[PDB]
Amino acid sequence: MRIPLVGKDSIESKDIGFTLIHEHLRVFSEAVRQQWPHLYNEDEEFRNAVNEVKRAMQFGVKTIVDPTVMGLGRDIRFMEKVVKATGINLVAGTGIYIYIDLPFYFLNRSIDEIADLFIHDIKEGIQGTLNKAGFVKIAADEPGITKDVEKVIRAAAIANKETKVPIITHSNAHNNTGLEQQRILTEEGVDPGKILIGHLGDTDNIDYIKKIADKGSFIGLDRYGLDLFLPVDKRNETTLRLIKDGYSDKIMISHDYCCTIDIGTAKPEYKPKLAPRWSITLIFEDTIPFLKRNGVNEEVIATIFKENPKKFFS
Amino acid sequence: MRIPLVGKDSIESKDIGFTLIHEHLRVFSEAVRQQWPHLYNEDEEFRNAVNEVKRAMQFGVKTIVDPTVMGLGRDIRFMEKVVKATGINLVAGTGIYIYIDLPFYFLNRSIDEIADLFIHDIKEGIQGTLNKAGFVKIAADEPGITKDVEKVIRAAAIANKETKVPIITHSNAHNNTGLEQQRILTEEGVDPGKILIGHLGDTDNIDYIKKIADKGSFIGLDRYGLDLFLPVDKRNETTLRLIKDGYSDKIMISHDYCCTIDIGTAKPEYKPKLAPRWSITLIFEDTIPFLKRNGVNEEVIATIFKENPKKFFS
Ligand SMILES: [Co+2]
Ligand SMILES: [Co+2]
Ligand SMILES: [Fe+2]
Ligand SMILES: [Fe+2]
Numbered sequence: 001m002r003i004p005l006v007g008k009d010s011i012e013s014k015d016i017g018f019t020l021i022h023e024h025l026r027v028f029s030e031a032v033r034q035q036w037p038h039l040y041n042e043d044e045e046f047r048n049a050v051n052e053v054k055r056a057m058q059f060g061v062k063t064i065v066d067p068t069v070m071g072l073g074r075d076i077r078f079m080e081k082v083v084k085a086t087g088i089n090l091v092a093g094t095g096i097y098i099y100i101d102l103p104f105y106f107l108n109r110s111i112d113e114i115a116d117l118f119i120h121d122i123k124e125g126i127q128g129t130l131n132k133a134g135f136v137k138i139a140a141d142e143p144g145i146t147k148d149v150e151k152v153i154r155a156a157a158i159a160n161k162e163t164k165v166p167i168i169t170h171s172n173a174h175n176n177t178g179l180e181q182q183r184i185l186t187e188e189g190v191d192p193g194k195i196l197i198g199h200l201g202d203t204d205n206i207d208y209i210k211k212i213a214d215k216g217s218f219i220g221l222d223r224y225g226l227d228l229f230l231p232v233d234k235r236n237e238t239t240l241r242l243i244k245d246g247y248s249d250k251i252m253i254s255h256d257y258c259c260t261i262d263i264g265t266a267k268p269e270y271k272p273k274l275a276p277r278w279s280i281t282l283i284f285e286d287t288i289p290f291l292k293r294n295g296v297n298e299e300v301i302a303t304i305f306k307e308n309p310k311k312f313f314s
Numbered sequence: 315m316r317i318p319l320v321g322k323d324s325i326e327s328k329d330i331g332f333t334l335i336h337e338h339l340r341v342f343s344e345a346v347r348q349q350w351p352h353l354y355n356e357d358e359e360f361r362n363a364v365n366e367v368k369r370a371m372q373f374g375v376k377t378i379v380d381p382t383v384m385g386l387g388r389d390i391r392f393m394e395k396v397v398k399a400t401g402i403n404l405v406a407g408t409g410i411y412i413y414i415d416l417p418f419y420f421l422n423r424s425i426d427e428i429a430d431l432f433i434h435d436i437k438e439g440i441q442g443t444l445n446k447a448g449f450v451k452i453a454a455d456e457p458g459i460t461k462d463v464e465k466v467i468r469a470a471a472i473a474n475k476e477t478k479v480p481i482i483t484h485s486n487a488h489n490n491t492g493l494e495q496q497r498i499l500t501e502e503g504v505d506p507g508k509i510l511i512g513h514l515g516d517t518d519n520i521d522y523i524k525k526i527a528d529k530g531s532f533i534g535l536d537r538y539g540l541d542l543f544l545p546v547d548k549r550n551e552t553t554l555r556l557i558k559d560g561y562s563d564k565i566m567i568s569h570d571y572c573c574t575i576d577i578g579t580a581k582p583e584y585k586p587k588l589a590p591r592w593s594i595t596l597i598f599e600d601t602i603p604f605l606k607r608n609g610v611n612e613e614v615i616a617t618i619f620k621e622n623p624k625k626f627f628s
Contacts, residue, residue: 028419029417029418030345031345031385032384034344034384035344035384035441037442038434038442070349070350101413103343103346104343104576104577105578106577106578107578108579108581108584113578127350127351128351263419263420264420264423267422270422
């Protein structure tokens with residue numbers, strides 16, 4: 001009776017268990033898939049998602065939070081089927097993922113109208129189902145905090161204030177967008193501890209990363225495996241340094257893995273150089289063992305993957 | 315047989331008859347409708363489109379060309395439903411409607427891959443049906459010819475050269491985008507006579523409009539009713555001037571009417587202010603009568619609404 005789950009009764013936050021806070025069962029461009037269905041294979045997508053979730057569960061993952069929202073091809077019914085086939089705790093979200101402008105629908109519509117969409121998903125349910133959103137996802141990237149990006153951020157703040165769900169962000173680690181997202185959300189009255197500023201693991205600039213944590217928000221070291229953003233070894237070094245400097249209670253770790261994704265960058269022939277070891281279980285194979293043999297106590301692991309998510313959703 | 319029609323056998327261009335070259339049965343943002351179905355009412359959308367098309371047919375319209383493509387919510391099955399209900403000849407298109415960047419799908423994809431999508435729709439069919447595209451639609455607006463906009467234009471050229479279908483554009487009448495579209499397409503080897511440069515009726519700058527006509531392309535005086543872009547009377551004066559100057563061989567006229575559109579700008583409360591007399595039959599009620607009492611004969615009306623679309627699709 002707190003965190004809504006796809007295809008299940010809602011759960012208390014104290015019962016979330018070991019959590020992967022940022023993974024995607026499937027990502028696609030809504031307009032492309034609608035216009036050219038021949039490009040997609042739902043059987044393969046389902047197979048890939050089920051296989052990955054099953055392996056995560058074998059490593060002890062109890063809950064997966066999937067920030068696929070408008071602009072990334074959120075499909076609650078696809079998510080339902082994956083849950084059915086695996087028994088995973090899956091937290092679905094609402095929100096809008098844009099880099100520049102909103103869809104034309106939003107021309108001459110207020111921030112209130114946008115927030116209403118989020119509240120609908122949180123209180124009523126997603127895409128005509130009774131599966132409810134457990135959080136709001138927003139984005140900004142290379143283009144910075146544009147007018148429309150800002151509208152979406154302020155709409156997310158309204159939704160959090162009304163429903164108490166936390167906010168997960170996508171940011172670009174190199175241009176201050178994460179710090180700006182946090183600033184705007186907190187100014188709108190969002191509790192800093194209800195914000196996860198995403199993709200900060202894409203940089204080794206620990207001074208910037210600590211600024212965000214210092215202002216009270218979780219920091220997303222959340223793209224493990226995506227070497228094109230930052231290699232695994234450098235991520236590991238950065239994660240280890242943050243832990244040693246006392247930032248464990250702010251750290252969240254994940255892969256941002258896409259069991260299937262439709263962008264051209266994700267073509268199989270680019271995998272070897274861009275993301276050779278990227279999968280939903282890389283941290284069990286590399287990161288966690290690495291931390292443990294570099295003096296990191298098990299209590300820190302519990303904090304990052306259990307306590308922090310519990311707090312985020314409380 | 316030459317021009318494919320939705321839900322009908324293809325027709326020869328000589329049988330196209332009185333044509334509205336740019337009208338929309340329904341426009342929506344794909345991602346918004348997919349994520350928040352509660353905002354839409356397909357019954358109402360269907361009724362609106364059927365009612366408008368029936369009135370157009372009563373006034374002698376034989377064929378409607380509907381350039382709703384990716385980015386505007388093309389839905390071939392909705393189009394089929396309207397054809398069945400009305401008996402209209404409906405030409406559907408392929409293409410991409412963007413102002414700034416392509417959907418993320420297109421990250422690291424070639425211009426050829428884009429063209430392949432268009433060729434698929436033209437040669438195989440649209441959205442898994444046997445209804446084929448009869449033209450390619452591209453756009454550019456206030457942001458100008460961005461890198462991604464330019465890719466789409468060049469993709470349209472490949473599609474035209476390969477399949478001979480014509481190209482219809484959306485442009486901004488005030489920033490030279492129409493002229494640039496024409497230049498890029500012709501430089502790629504597209505026959506200027508297979509291009510309609512759209513939304514030129516949004517300006518009363520006849521020197522600009524004539525520049526495009528002189529270069530061999532049709533000029534889209536195609537937003538009659540949309541006063542916020544240019545009021546009916548000034549459009550009429552511009553149209554009449556171009557006709558008196560001898561340009562009826564390049565003129566195409568339409569409303570760009572949307573029987574339903576989901577953008578906030580089109581909320582009913584704004585209609586009286588922005589587009590009070592906008593509908594799919596305005597040119598029958600105002601424009602054509604206006605031209606006639608200004609000495610324009612039935613032959614010129616025939617050239618614009620029958621002969622020009624015939625040539626365009628030949
Ligand atoms: Co992201
Ligand atoms: Co247009
Ligand atoms: Fe993500
Ligand atoms: Fe249009």
